[PDB]
Structure formats: structure tokens, C-alpha cells
Paper text:
Here, we describe the cryo-EM structure of S. cerevisiae TORC2 at 7.9 Å resolution. TORC2 adopts a twofold symmetric rhombohedral structure comprising two copies of each subunit. In agreement with previous structures, Lst8 is bound to the catalytic kinase domain and positioned at the obtuse angle of the rhombohedron, clearly sticking out from the central part of the complex. Specifically, in Sc TORC2, the dimer interface is mediated by four contacts between helices Nα25, 27, 29 of the spiral of Tor2 in one protomer, and helices Nα44, 46, 48, 50 of the bridge of Tor2 in the second protomer. However, the central cavity in TORC2 is significantly smaller and an interaction of the Tor2 molecules is observed in the centre of the complex. We built a homology model for Avo239 and placed it into the density corresponding to Finger3, which shows clear alpha-helical features. In our model, Avo3 contacts the bridge of Tor2 (helices Nα46,48,50) in the same protomer and the spiral of Tor2 (helices Nα27 and Nα29) in the other protomer. In conclusion, Avo3 and Raptor occupy the same region of the interface formed by the Tor2/mTOR HEAT domains, committing the complexes to TORC2 and TORC1 assembly, respectively. Notably, our present TORC2 cryo-EM structure demonstrates that Avo3 is localized in proximity to the FRB domain of Tor2 and sterically interferes with FKBP12-rapamycin binding. This is the molecular basis of TORC2’s insensitivity to rapamycin.
Author numbering:
A (entry chain J): 647 to 792
B (entry chain C): 1751 to 1771, 1814 to 2474
C (entry chain D): 3 to 302
D (entry chain C): 785 to 870, 915 to 965
E (entry chain C): 1207 to 1295, 1321 to 1449
Write the structure that this text describes.
Amino acid sequence: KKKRTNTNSVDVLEYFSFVCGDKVPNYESMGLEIYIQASKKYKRNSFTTKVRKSSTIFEVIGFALFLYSTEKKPDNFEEDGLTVEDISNPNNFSLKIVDEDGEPFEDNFGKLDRKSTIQSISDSEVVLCKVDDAEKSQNEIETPLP
Amino acid sequence: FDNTWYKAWHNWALANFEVISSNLIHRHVIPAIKGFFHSISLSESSSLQDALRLLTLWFTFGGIPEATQAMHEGFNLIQIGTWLEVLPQLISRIHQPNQIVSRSLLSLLSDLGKAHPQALVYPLMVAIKSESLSRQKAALSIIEKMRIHSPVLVDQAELVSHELIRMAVLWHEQWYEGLDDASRQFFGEHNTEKMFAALEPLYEMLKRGPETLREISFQNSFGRDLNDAYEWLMNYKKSKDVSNLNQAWDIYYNVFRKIGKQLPQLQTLELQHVSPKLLSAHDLELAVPGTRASGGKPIVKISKFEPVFSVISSKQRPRKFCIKGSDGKDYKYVLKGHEDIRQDSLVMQLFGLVNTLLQNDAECFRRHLDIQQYPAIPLSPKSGLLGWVPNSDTFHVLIREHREAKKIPLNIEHWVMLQMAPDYDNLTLLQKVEVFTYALNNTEGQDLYKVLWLKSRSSETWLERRTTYTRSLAVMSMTGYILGLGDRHPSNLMLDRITGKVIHIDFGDCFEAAILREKFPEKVPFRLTRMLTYAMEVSGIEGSFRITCENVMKVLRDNKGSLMAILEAFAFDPLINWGFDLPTKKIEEETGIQLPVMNANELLSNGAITEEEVQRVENEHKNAIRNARAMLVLKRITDKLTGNDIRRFNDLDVPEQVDKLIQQATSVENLCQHYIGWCPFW
Amino acid sequence: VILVSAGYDHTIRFWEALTGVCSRTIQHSDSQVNRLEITNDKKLLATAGHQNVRLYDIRTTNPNPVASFEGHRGNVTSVSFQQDNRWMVTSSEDGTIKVWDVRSPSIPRNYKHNAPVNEVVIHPNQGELISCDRDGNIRIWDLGENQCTHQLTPEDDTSLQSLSMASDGSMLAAANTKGNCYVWEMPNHTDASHLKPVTKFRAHSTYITRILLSSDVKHLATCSADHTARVWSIDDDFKLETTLDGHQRWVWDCAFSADSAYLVTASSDHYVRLWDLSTREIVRQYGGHHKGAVCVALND
Amino acid sequence: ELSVVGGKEMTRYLKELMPLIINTFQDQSNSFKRDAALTTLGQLAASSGYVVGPLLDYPELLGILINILKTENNPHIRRGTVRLIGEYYPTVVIHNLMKILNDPSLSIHHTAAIQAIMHIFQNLGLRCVSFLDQIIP
Amino acid sequence: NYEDEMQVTKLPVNQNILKNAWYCSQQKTKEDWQEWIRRLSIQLLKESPSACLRSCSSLVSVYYPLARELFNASFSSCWVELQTSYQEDLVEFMEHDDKPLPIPIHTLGKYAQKCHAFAKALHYKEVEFLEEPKNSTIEALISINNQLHQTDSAIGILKHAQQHNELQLKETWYEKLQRWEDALAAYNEKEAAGEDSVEVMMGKLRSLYALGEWEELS
């Protein structure tokens, strides 16, 4: 294809490989603690095997700048400046009973990829700064703080 | 038959002047105004206002030699003098199509613009940087006069016009940010042969290249190749356009990832590295880079300033501090970048209206104030030289040092909105009213007191900096309404760290904020951030709105008749304010009210060529998207604050122009609505 | 039985109005809370987005959108269903009163208001729509004519939040945002119908949300920002029948079940109360809410 | 000059008044006749020196106002005459000492050297509290 | 290496005991007070501000910043002390405490002025005028601000609180006619003030004078 060189898809949506067709894109279903239904949770725009669950939320500047509604979590909990994963949101492990597993934030986040739990149905955890210091400190290569 | 009181008897030369706008013979009988303007150009008539209508709404008539010999030679009897003002208007009015009496007045302006270009020449320092083509040729042959009139002063200010246009912002961040959006819609649209020359005119430029030592080289020395992978998009687009698809597929890419990795090193510069040319001026005469006001001062030099500047601090990036003026006086400046100094010249002109009509006023002149001509020249028609912003502190850092000293976030509102509201997205008017009046009852902004009240330092500098400001909400409060630009953003709502006086800064757009902005039709005079506009003064704008009742009443009627006509020639502001002031009330709710005052479509397809120029439609329709938005200051200064809008016509006088603001910073929720700039601070 | 709904909390909890517990337990997002009513057939209920109708077949508990219907800027001001049930006739925050066949995904007709429609309802004659405009103009839009006029302004410039007509054709009753509840009187007709002035009230001294003139048309259950769940009978009792207050209530409509003896306080206070209108006493208070409730569905 | 030496006489003041209070007869005051009457406002503040409140009242500062004949026309343009007049807080004071003690006419210049070595025992001290003071001290 | 200087501290009991001994007598406190502000000079043990005010020149102007040094340091210690915070009884040292340690003398702050009557504290009174704009504190604010001549907002908060706060009676007819305002209605506030004991009320008599006319007072 060209589906790599449009608007925000050289400034923000570069590492994603769009010319590459769907497995060099394995997609992503993020769902809030303000998913207050279970039917429109964050369906944009996959994983390049290469870029992490640092993908993902920075597409919540790139799900808030290709469906005009799932609100813009501001702006300093997304990301700082449009590269990688959410220093107050992780991803957390899904099981198979839709139990919102708070504690074992080290399968999908920044440490490894979000091609680390095979499934194109996960929820997430709330941060009370227990979650912010054993995840930005494992992530000084996956929060590119330019 | 005159022989008395000649100013009021010139309110006459003006009913014949406005009425007759060949017919007695009137080609004569113009002579009522033309010799009687010469009775009032005394000084009480300084009004340049009605002097332009004579040479403006005569530049339009032209006509027979009574043109110069009895009218313009009637001026050449007195003198320039007062044409220190309106010279940026005279460097816009450059083709007038009769040149034969007007080169001849442009010759005359070569003499007018040869005496005090020594001050200005700076309207010709701009002029030669943009085209005006056949009428910039006149501007270039008027340089012949400047090259006779000490070529020492004009060549120094030229050295730098250039050395600042050669320095202006960067070059390699600028060229790689003017490729960033160009061949982007050329790639995924296609624009094809449109943005085929939005990187071609950047090539030119790096024609001089590995140019100045350690920056216009360190980016083309290891940028020797930052050309070789353009000329594959050149040839073979001539020939394959899906085989060589794959080149704006690449060259696009490579240097972007470099641009960000190149935006955290764009602040501390040199100058040994880009301009060691502005390094080596050391001292020119003929700087006057912000003095230019009178001469008591005698033309400040530049005795410079840091090789190593300190840049803004925004996206735009035009080096803000101070460039040492020799009048031992550091010249305050923030250059201006890729812009328009006929907006900030009309932003000084119109601060020149207005403080001369703040001098003229009643009490309100013993208790006198005046809103501060902000120091700016146009470096390009797209650039400038601004002026340090002189003490202050703007409502974003002005709500910081509260919440700094107080330690309670700006989020808490938008986080007491992430608590009350999911946020405002969807949340119609009784709702946005709702989660307004719970993220407020809670909320308190006693801050303007508390920050007052740190200085204070008489326990009455509290009073003295306010009882300065109190009258300084009032003035540019009523100012920022009847005009426009209200601009709600906390960089606009600047406080003073000096006196506490009205600072607008970052001047948006000539017309008002409701039919703007689409981040809500925000309709308010301006804001009530209320306890920062309340705990400032006793009862929330009541001794202060006593004082908006002073300004409004005064500036409702004090000569509002004219005043108006040549504030309307901002009706037709030739090039910059044509240009920047149509696509003024923001064109996002405008173009659209009358597409079919006239025609536009089905005459641009049926003539062989009649689209180029078609004018009428579209260029005198952009002059009638103007004369249907401009008749519409004039019909928005006669039924709202003489001042038109609502249901409630007549005039609305003091009380009803007094409530048209208490209605609109309480009614209604319309004070709520704006957002990123509204930033709902009690 | 059915009701419902949610407020800021965004918790489509259907409970039953003749019982005590919870019918139908679905959290709500991706928009408010404009609309959570059961559709004329009372089965494909709208839960409402950016004009999203996603009709969740009250009978089958917890679904999946079944029949979108999306597409118009803003949010469906009100999803009336031209009882044909053939026509949805959505009055959105957009403006354009299209006029959805809610049995085919398309917009068959159009007519523009310049001053974000405020009110919509159907007269039940199929030849009517008595579509209202933030100016207030009740512009009588008949469903087979494209008529602006007939247009009449009850109160100029203050928005008509809320038009309630009757099932007859013997009223209306029209209350503006200011909470000034002009009562007009319809020659039950088709296409024309002349509005003829009984009584502007004071709604409310405060702000109206929507005055339904009952299933009965006997009351006028006038609910407000100031928390009151007032009912006002039809004849002369357009003079106070009730002031029903409460705590952050901001009850945002009314409903009448199937004898005008149950008022429902849709309030952001946590509670959707099924009171006892003629009896003014909370008979049935629902906890099924993180925070508030807005508008609202009581098809017995 | 007689405004400057009007102490060192009162008579150099009073007589200066009669060569305005009798130039008043024909000529007008407003010229400087505003500043020679504002150097009077001086020196009228400072009526505690130009000995009309202190020494003897000397029937004087009231031959002042009506010698400008300020009768029927007294306001306005005073505005045209504002025209003619043109923490480590413990270490802001550890200096406010040395700011004040910098006095030329000191009783003992040993109470500007006694008090200095009471900062030089000391902050001399932090060699940053010498290049801030002991370049200017 | 220089800077062997804690150097700043030291609290003064005994010494707050010797201030407690001389507050009965002095009562023109500026003599034995200033003696003792040489002893509130002695910060600690040694300093540059301590053996400093052993100076012979000792001026009241070094003594004022140095009367907060053995006091922001021994200060919040009620040891003798804030037991002797007010006594005590030319009053202008106070104003540097102030914005950043507060001190009580607010309600009595009529006392934060009556010692010098001026009504210098238009901001520790303006902190009590918004605290609660009381029915008698709004008009006491219409009084001490005709002094500051801020009437231009004391006919603000008199035209605001005649509109807003209730609807008042004796300060409204007297700052309306001060001033065209109520000229002949402050005189029609003689036709509803020939019942209020006309005589002294000068709102009803002035627009006969405020304004010739002298015929209504002949």
C-alpha cells in the first residue's frame, strides 16, 4: 500500500507500519474505569511485534483527533509529547471471566509489548501513587520524554 | 465668508465634502474643504482621521491639476509633519491607475517619506522585501532619494531589513518546516502538480548550502545528502508517477523521527553559527529599534545584545529580550515571526486614536489613564520585530503563582469536571449551567486579593496598584468590546508587575468573539474570573463599572460620527489588514449569512479566459464580503454600544450600552459555553 | 413495566412501576443521556449518542444496536415514532427536523431550524408535527407539506426547551427555558390548525425542563432546575396542583402510568422516585445509580 | 535665588513676594512668576521650613495664592501642572545592615570597621553575601 | 575555607521577663523598649544582628528589621511572651510580620488603627468589610473610604448594598446628593422625611441650598 504517510499517520503514527497489511498489526481492544458500556470501550490502530502497549493511548493525538464522541483522560496523567505509553493508566491481565485484575500491571504496559497476551478480550487498572514506580522507571525507554 | 471659531467652522469644510460623495462643476467644488483644510493644517487639526478622507476617498478621484497646484501644493504651501503617522497605510496605498498625479505624489513622498526617512525609511525597509513588481519599482527608485539622503543611515538599517531577514527566525528549523505539511497533501490526497512547488522555491537557500560555520554548515556537512533523494521526485515525474509512487514515500520521511530529535535545541543560538555577520554589527545609528517616540532619545543605536539569543517559547519561535540600545538602554523586545506589523501598527495607530480622542475626556482626564501602542516593525510583509512583556506576567502564569504559593492545581474545575461532570463534549446549555455553577458555589478565587496583597509593599499600594488597575479593568474592558480581538485566553489576559494596569497582549483578530470562535459562540463584553475581578475591588465591578459608566458614556457619542469614516479606511484596509482581515470575526461563523451579494458561478467555465481577473466575483463580492461585514462596525456604531445588534433598538444610551454589559461578563449559560483558552475560573 | 434512567453517572437501569427491584441492569457511556423512552410498539428503545439511536429488541434483558439510524453535529434536542411506527422523526441539536421509516436506514424528507429545533411530537391524525424552533417559534411542520408557515412566537428569543400536545388535539401547553409555562388551543385538525390563546404562567418561578400534559390529559407534570417535581389538572388547575421539592435534583421531565396517580423524579442526586402524584409521597425511592438521573421512560 | 535663601533672612522671602505682590497690580502669575510658584509649593510642604508653622504665623505662606489672582478661576488643569512637576529573610538583613551601615557620616568610621569585622569575623563567610557587597562596602 | 558561621534562632526567657518587667511603665513605650530592643537585638550566643547593636550609631530605622530576628525565630514560644503580645499601652513596626506570621486585633481593629483614630489600615478593615459585609460595617465603609475620596466605590457599595443588600435609609439620601442624585427626590425624601423629626435630615435641606433656591431656605 501507500492505509504510513498521511496527516498524523511522520509526527505521531509513524512506528505502526500501515503499508504492512494484517503479521509484521496484531489489533487492540483499551477499556476505561470510566467504561461507565462494555460495547464501545479503544479500537485504533493495532501493534507493530515491535512497538509496545506504548501504542495505544498517545491513539487516544493521532480516538480523539478519526470518530468526532470516548472522551479526550487529559492531556498530566494519554502521554506528554505523542510517542508512547500512559509515566496514570496501564493495561492489565485479560483472564477469561472479565475479572478486572488490578495487581498482576506487568504483562501489557511498557515493559513488554501488547503482543504479550495473544488476544484481537483486556481491561485496565487505576493509579494511586503501588503502580507508577515499578512499571516510568521500568519505562525510561518507553515514555520518550522531540 | 469666515474671518473665528476655524475648527468648528471647519466642522462645516467637512454638511458640501460628506454630502457630495462631476455632477456644479464638482471636479472645484471639493473647494470648501480642500482650501479650508489648509484655514484648519493648525494643530487643533492633528486629526489625520479626516485630513485621510480628502487624500484617500482624492486617490480613489485623481483628476485635474487643482489636484496638486491648489490642493496638494496647498499642503506643500504647510508640510510631511503629521505624515510620520499613516506612512504604513502610505506604503499600502503603493498603485494609485492615475500615477501621472499620484509616482508624482509617491517623487513627492520620495521627498516626504527624504525628510523624516532619517527617523522613517522603515516603511521602505519593508515596502523592498515584498513585491508591489511595477509599484515596488517606484519604491526602489525612491531608494535613490535615500541613497542621496545619507545612503551611511539607510545602508545601516538595510546591513541589518537584511542581516534581520537573513537572521527573522530557524532556516535549517524553518526550508524543514515549510517541507513538513507541503508535499503531504500533494502525498495522500492528491493536490499532484499543486504542492509540486512547495519544496521547490526551499531549494534555493540550500543552493548556498556546508553556508555559515557550525549550523547554515553542520546541517548540510552531514546533510550533503539532505538534497540527493529530491531529484528522484523531479525526474521522473516529467516521465512513471506508480513506480517513482515510492519517493515522496521516503525523502518525505528521513528528516522528521531528525526535526524533533533538531525542535530540544532551538532556544540558545549563535550567530557565530548562522548570522558571524549579526555578530560582528557592533555599532548602528540608525537602529532606533523601539524608540522612533519623539526626539528629546536622538535616534538610538545598537551597541547588541547576546552572538548567543533566547527564543520564544511557542510554536511560531521568534527570538524574545534586551538588544542594547547606545542611549546604555537595553532595547525591551520579543522579533516577531512569520506574520503582521499592518494589523500591530493598527493595533499602535489605533491606540493612537483614542488616548489623544482617553486626553480629550472629562475626569476620567484628572484621573487620567491610557492603554499602552505596542512596540512593533514588519520585517517581512511574513515576519516582524516586536516589543518585552514591559512588567508582567499574564491570566497563564497569573493563575500559577497563586496555585504556586497556595499549592492547589489548575486541574482541580477541570479535574471539583473530571469529578462533577464525563466532561462538559455534549453536556446542552441546563447542563457544561450544571457541572459550571458544581466545579463553583465550592470554588473561590480570592487569590486577586491574597497575590494585592503581597504588594501592597503601604499595606495602600494594594489600593494604589488597583485604585491604578480598578481604573485601568474599566478602560481596555470597554475597549476590548466595541472593537473586538475579546480574546479570553489566560496568554491574552496579562496583568502589571510594575503602578497594575490593563494588559491586552497577543492580538487575535479585529472583530468580536461570539461570531468567532468552533469552540462555542462565546456572547460576552469580555471575563469575570469573578473573585479575581471582584476581591480586587469591593463590590464586583460597581465602583468599577462606576468607572465603565464614566468610559462607555464618554466613548459612545465623544465625535463618534467621525472618528468613524476613516476608521472605515478599515472598511478597505490595500494587502495586509486584505489579506488577514477577511478570511475578522473568524471565517469558521461567516462565509454564508449573502454565496449567491452577487453571482460567483455560471457567466469561469464559458468565457475562454474571464476567471484570472473576474473581480465584481470574488478580488469588489472580497471587498463586498467586506462592505457586508465592515457596512455591518458601523452597523455593529447605531442601535446597541452608537454599537448595533438582540431585539431593543433606538440607541440604548447610558443605562440600556451600560446593561447591553452587566446582560452579556452576567448573561447568561453563555458566560460558560468557550474552552484550552477559557481555562472556568471562579 | 419499565424505568430507567441515568444522569452524569452514565447506571440504563430499568426498574418496574408495579413492584420494587430491577427489571434490567445496564452502566452507560460514549455520550450522555439525552435519551434510556420505549418505542409509540413499546418493545427497540433508544442509549442517546452523537444523534445515536442504538435501539436496545426492554423484553430481552441486556443487549446486542439492532435497528443506526445515526446521521446528524451535537445531540437527538429530542429519538418523536410520523404512529404509521412505517415513520422516528428526530429533532436533534443539529437544527434539521429529519423525518426518520424507522424500518429502513435513511432520511426521506428535510426542513430547516436556523435557531438548535427545541421541540418533537406527532398529531395523532400521520396527516402532523406541532416542529418548534432557540427563538421559540411553534412552526406548524405538517408531515406531507414542507411547511415554514404556521409559525407563531409565544415568547421571543428565550428558548422553548418544551412542547405538553395532547392525545386529542384540544390543547397545547408551551413553556420556555425561563420557566414561563403560552397555553394555546387547537380548531384537532390536519395541516393548518389555529394556535389560539388559555393562559403565559409562571412555571415555576425558576427554569422549566418539560411541562408532559398527561397519558390522561386530565394534568401538567412542570419539572425544574430548582428540584421541584410539580404537577399542575387541565381545567383551571393550570393553577397549582403540586410543588414536589428535593435535594441537586435539577427533576428532568415526567411519567404517568396506565390512571394519572403516579407522578417520576428523574434526578444529579442518585434517585430514578416513582412517587404517588395525587396521593405527593415517595412510594417507589432508585438505588441503582453512582450519581444522577435525567430523562427517562414510563409504556406500562 | 530668594526662594532658596528666603531661611537665612524670612525677609528675603517676604519683600520677593511685594517685586511678584505688586507686579500683581498690572502683570500675569501662572512663565516660571508656574515653577517659581512650585519649586513656592516646595517650600510650602515644607511650610515647616519656609517658618510659617515653626519660627514666628508669619503672615506669609498666606502673602502666596491669590499673590498666582486663584479666585473665581482655580480648577481644572492640575493635570497640566502632574505634567509640570515630569525566606533566609535573615540574610536580606544580614547585608540591610552593612545597605544602612554604608553611611559616609558615621560616629565611629571604625560602629561602618567595628560592625564590619563583627561580617569579615563572619558573611565575608560565604564568599559569594564578598562579591555582592564588598565590591560596592 | 571561610564560613564557620550556625548565623541565625535562640529563644528570650529569661531576658519577653526583664521586655513582661519595665510593661506597666513607658506609655510612649518608642525609651526602655528600644533599651530592650537592643537586648531583641541579641539574637544568639554570636552574629554580625546579635554582637551587632552594641553600636554607638544605634538607629531606630537597624532596630526595626532586627526586632523580628530575636522575635520570626523565638516566634510562635508563648514563653512569657505572646503572654505579652499586646500589652501595650510612633505603632508602625508591626506591618512586616504580616501578610507572610499573622497575628490577632481584627474586629479589635478600629485598635489596629485608635492609637494613631487615621482610618492607615484601610485593608485590615477592608479584610473586615468583605469578611461579612454587615448591614453596620458597609456604612462604616461608606465613611472611612469619604476620607480616602474611594467614594467613586463607596457610592459603589452604597448604590449597591440602596439594589442589593436589603434597601437602606440614612447613608443613601445624604451619598446620592453629593452629587445630581434621588437633586428633587432627596427633597421628596423630605415629603417622606417630615415624619422621620424634618429640621436635621442634610439630604432634605441641601438641594435647597447642593443647589440659589435662597427663597424654600428663606
